[PDB]
Amino acid sequence: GSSGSSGPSGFPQNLHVTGLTTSTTELAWDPPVLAERNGRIISYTVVFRDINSQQELQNITTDTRFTLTGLKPDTTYDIKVRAWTSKGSGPLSPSIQSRTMPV
């Protein structure tokens, strides 16, 4: 329902890694276009998971960027992001599958 939970209807862009790592993986995206915004943003959720494994994990940060950790080297990692509003959560950005650097 609207009252119970509304959340945004749009996802951010420019989602990519500015400097991945064998174990860790940096990130850097941008906020949703003024057009696709059902209110205001407060934080984002970075959901990272190994497309090869069934281990799902995510993170939270009040910034348009983030840095994963505890990942395997030379392994594709499906990482995504999603904006959050005072109401709740919205859609989920398209994973990039940034494969950590080959140690």
Swiss-Prot record:
The chain holds residues 915 to 1010 of 1907 of the full protein. Interacts with GRIP1. Interacts with PPFIA1, PPFIA2 and PPFIA3. Interacts with INSR. It is found in: Membrane. Residues 11-103 form the Fibronectin type-III domain. Possible cell adhesion receptor. It possesses an intrinsic protein tyrosine phosphatase activity (PTPase) and dephosphorylates EPHA2 regulating its activity. Belongs to the protein-tyrosine phosphatase family. Receptor class 2A subfamily. This is Receptor-type tyrosine-protein phosphatase F. Glycans are attached at residue 59. It is linked to Aplasia or hypoplasia of the breasts and/or nipples 2: A group of congenital deformities encompassing total absence of breasts and nipple (amastia), absence of the nipple (athelia), and absence of the mammary gland (amazia).
